[PDB]
Amino acid sequence: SVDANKVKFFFGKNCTGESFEYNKGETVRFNNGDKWNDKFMSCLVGSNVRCNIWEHNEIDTPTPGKFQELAQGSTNNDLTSINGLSKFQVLPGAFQWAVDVKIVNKVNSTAGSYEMTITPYQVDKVACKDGDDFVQLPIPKLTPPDSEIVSHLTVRQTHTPYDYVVNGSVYFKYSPTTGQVTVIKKDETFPKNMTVTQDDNTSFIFNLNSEK
């Protein structure tokens, strides 16, 4: 059986062919240059976890790709309507949606010595050091989705001089229309020394262009 707290995916309708298992609060990419990215046919999604699948994380481009929000507490004997899912997100009942975040040096030619800490509206604050892989920032029940969640971004060198590099605020927003996340940043809250580019749908890459 499927656990109410985990998910599982099989390469054959009615659970046949091959088997796979995924814990809550994880993200994977299953693709090999557009062919066997699918690797699914029957899956089960526990009554206290959700799945979110995204073709090629389309950025509201002039072609909508393929996307499905596997309803928390359901079984899918076939999803071939949405063969398009080169990215997979598996999230607990505690977390409504989650966002890929990463840090890149555009001035500090050292890495690891630069540590960024982000904390959205009373969430589990997350700190990552420039050189680790993409961090995941889960967000709890955020209803209505089109609301703007207040968030705080602060980045500080872990090595002398270790002053606050920048300290400011940011705003995140969600859209269930295509499971898109969008970030709103203004000179009144966000600094002019870091910027964040939308590398993909639900994927944000912060680059530091001024140590001040």
Positions in the binding site for Ca ion (CB under 5 A): 34, 37-38, 41, 58, 60, 80, 86, 178, 180, 201
Residue with smaller CB distance to Ca ion, 37 or 151: 37
Bridge partners (DSSP) listed for residue 116: 128, 155
Q: How far is the CB of 146 from Ca ion (least distance, A)?
A: 14
Residue with smaller CB distance to Ca ion, 57 or 96: 57
Residue with smaller CB distance to Ca ion, 60 or 148: 60
Instruction: Return d(Cα 160, Cα 157) in angstroms, integer.
Output: 7
Angle at 146 between CA 140 and CA 150, to 5 degrees: 60
Structure tokens at 16: 């046949």
Neighbours of 92 (CB within 10 A): 20
Q: How far is the CB of 139 from Ca ion (least distance, A)?
A: 17
Nearest position to Ca ion, beta carbon? 178
Q: How far is the CB of 23 from Ca ion (least distance, A)?
A: 23
Instruction: Return d(Cα 211, Cα 193) in angstroms, integer.
Output: 7
Report the largest interatomic distance among the alpha carbons of the chain, rounded to a whole angstrom: 60
Residue with smaller CB distance to Ca ion, 58 or 100: 58
